[PDB]
Design a protein around this ligand. Structure first.
Ligand SMILES: *[C@@H]1O[C@H](CO)[C@@H](O[C@@H]2O[C@H](CO)[C@@H](O)[C@H](O)[C@H]2NC(C)=O)[C@H](O)[C@H]1NC(C)=O
Lengths: 197, 222, 210
């Protein structure tokens, strides 16, 4: 009877950055996905691998809710098989991804005049990320062929660039809060089921 | 008839002293034994001590032996209970009752025991001061419900009446809840039809004797 | 010193026959007493030394005194009879009571009507937000309330007080008081309290916005 704590996912006052994206395992509860798509609040809503109609009828063994924050132009990279700064160094969606990605604009709650630079994103890395691999490393990356002993110099930068979220910016650079629901189906009895299955 | 009226309990910090008064009326007092039993808020009854027909037989209970003494003035038909070394746990409402069956106590078996006739809630509050409440509306929005919010008052005995207590139908006064801040919290609600939300004016009369506070608060819709 | 036992938490329809058995501890007690304690009032001696009720009682009560075990019989249950019933022993002077028996008269099931209340703007000046949800005139008291702020349960933020059963209609009434501050009230937008009662099929959610 106890429903899945989706309200503890989207409405959360504090969201993490994207380089350190948060994950809340969802298990042993009842899905009510009708709350998601019966709403005009979500800007980008793209279900990958799952039916657009069987949403409330399915039953997956486990569900993972990956929630973080990026700007308006970076949500196009939250999709299986994409290339880009977020889609290489922060959050990598596998090609066989099976779940629904939910995005909406939050330019009023995650921005403030003068600046709200709490949010970060990984700008540099010497290798692309693997799927679901959370990277929060804090070492000074080296760009050129000239070594760096940690000194923040010409080609030695801190690998986490802050997000400048002000209300008076272009849409592409406004805070969008993202929730990625990952449907895990293992050789085990299901735990997260819908209301009409 | 016979009435064991009591008065003398209040609010006192732990470690001090405070004596209780039980007043006898009607029956012959120097003929019956007298008991003292207390009941905590939400708990059950608990025996305290007892006295004979002034036969010098106290026989107090435990956790109070040396801390309470029973005294009676049979020429005054009044029975007392001297408190001292206040364990803060002693916060309870004390009842004094008659007895006519005890053995080494009152001479001869007359009548039953423990015809309670009790009163006088005795609260051994901590150092925290006696605080008056802050009444807030519980305005409605659209039977229609309507109430007031009695919040942040340390002493418990608060009362409430709606529009000079001539409106007593459909009224629900709730017991208090103890907040985390050591203060109580009470709500009193009345459900009235929507056809009278604009015609008749509703006011809650909150009364708090220990704080000496009385606030008449209106309740107007949003 | 004894630890007198008693089966509490009784429920019977109007005009029935109920019993309470106070079995004593070591050193078998003779001649217990039976009292009734309605809410807000001092107790009243119903029965004498294990039998022989006093004068004034409506004679619907009785009991039998046999050594270690005792019984308290009520015939012809009354609407104006809901109270708490204690048994007291007196043969060793440290008198000890029973557990007390709350009494609820079985009435036709009542569904609850639920009303919500926002915190007053006057309270917001004190930096506190107290949201109040009402449950009123429902006879089965085993109802649950779960506050859903933005559809997320708030555990450890609410206290609910349940009234004594009413005398005329014999229905309960409880009221939960969700307590917040001005800060965590100003980041959320919708406040509701879901209700589940023995006379409810689907949950009842009364909500409001700020
Ligand atoms: C917070 O969670 C709740 C429920 O998951 C969502 O609130 C819903 O909002 C829609 C659109 O206004 C309403 O039609 C529903 O009635 C609401 N449901 C409840 C129970 O409140 C809301 O979408 C979530 N907020 C965020 C940040 O996504």
């Amino acid at each position: 009877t106890n429903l899945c704590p989706f309200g503890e996912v989207f409405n959360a006052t504090r969201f993490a950055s994207v380089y350190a994206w948060n994950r809340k395992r969802i298990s042993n509860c009842v899905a009510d996905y009708s709350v998601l798509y019966n709403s005009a609040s979500f800007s980008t809503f793209k279900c990958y691998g799952v039916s657009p109609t069987k949403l409330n009828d399915l039953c997956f063994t486990n569900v993972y809710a990956d929630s973080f924050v990026i700007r308006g132009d970076e949500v196009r990279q939250i999709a299986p098989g994409q290339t880009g700064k977020i889609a290489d160094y922060n959050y990598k969606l596998p090609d066989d991804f099976t779940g629904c990605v939910i995005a909406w604009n939050s330019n009023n709650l995650d921005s403030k005049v003068g600046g709200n630079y709490n949010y970060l994103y990984r700008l540099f890395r010497k290798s692309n990320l693997k799927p679901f691999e959370r990277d929060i490393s804090t070492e000074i990356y080296q760009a050129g062929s000239t070594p760096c002993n940690g000194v923040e110099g010409f080609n030695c930068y801190f690998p986490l660039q802050s997000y400048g979220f002000q209300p008076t910016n272009g849409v592409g650079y406004q805070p969008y809060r993202v929730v990625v629901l990952s449907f895990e189906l293992l050789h085990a009895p299901a735990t997260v089921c819908g209301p009409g299955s | 008839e016979v009435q064991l009226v009591e008065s003398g309990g209040g609010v006192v910090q732990p470690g001090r002293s405070l004596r209780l008064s039980c007043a006898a009326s009607g029956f012959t007092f120097s003929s019956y034994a007298m008991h003292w039993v207390r009941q905590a808020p939400g708990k059950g009854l608990e025996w305290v001590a007892v006295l004979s027909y002034d036969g010098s037989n106290k026989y107090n209970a435990d956790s109070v032996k040396g801390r309470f003494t029973i005294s009676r003035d049979n020429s005054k038909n009044t029975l007392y209970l001297q408190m001292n070394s206040l364990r803060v746990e002693d916060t309870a409402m004390y009842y004094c009752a008659r007895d006519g069956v005890s053995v080494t106590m009152v001479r001869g078996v007359i009548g039953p025991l423990c015809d309670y006739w009790g009163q006088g809630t005795l609260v051994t509050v901590s150092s925290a001061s006696t605080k008056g409440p802050s009444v807030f509306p519980l305005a409605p929005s659209s039977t229609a419900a309507l109430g007031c919010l009695v919040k942040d008052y340390f002493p418990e005995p608060v009362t409430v009446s709606w529009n000079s207590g001539a409106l007593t139908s459909g009224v629900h006064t709730f017991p208090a809840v103890l907040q985390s801040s050591g203060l109580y919290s009470l709500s009193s609600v009345v459900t009235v039809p929507s056809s009278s939300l604009g015609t008749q004016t509703y006011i809650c009369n909150v009364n708090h004797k220990p704080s000496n506070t009385k606030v008449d608060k209106r309740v107007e819709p949003k | 010193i004894q630890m007198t036992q008693s089966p509490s938490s009784l429920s019977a329809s109007v005009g029935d026959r109920v019993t309470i058995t106070c079995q004593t501890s070591q050193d078998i007690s003779n001649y217990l007493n039976w009292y009734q304690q309605k809410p807000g009032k001092a107790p009243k001696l119903l029965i004498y030394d294990a039998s022989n009720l006093e004068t004034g009682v409506p004679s619907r009560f009785s009991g039998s005194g046999s050594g270690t075990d005792f019984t308290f019989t009520i015939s012809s249950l009354q609407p104006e009879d809901i109270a708490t019933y204690y048994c007291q022993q007196y043969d060793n002077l440290p008198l000890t009571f029973g557990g007390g028996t709350k009494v609820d008269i079985k009435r036709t099931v009542a569904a609850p009507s639920v009303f919500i209340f926002p915190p007053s703007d006057e309270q917001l000046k004190s930096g506190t937000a107290s949201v109040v949800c009402l449950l009123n005139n429902f006879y089965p008291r085993e109802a649950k309330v779960q506050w859903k702020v933005d559809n997320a349960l708030q555990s450890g933020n609410s206290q609910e007080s349940v009234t004594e059963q009413d005398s005329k209609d014999s229905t309960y009434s409880l009221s939960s008081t969700l307590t917040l501050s001005k800060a965590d009230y100003e980041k959320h937008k919708v406040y509701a309290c879901e209700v589940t009662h023995q006379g409810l099929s689907s949950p009842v959610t009364k909500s409001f916005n700020r």
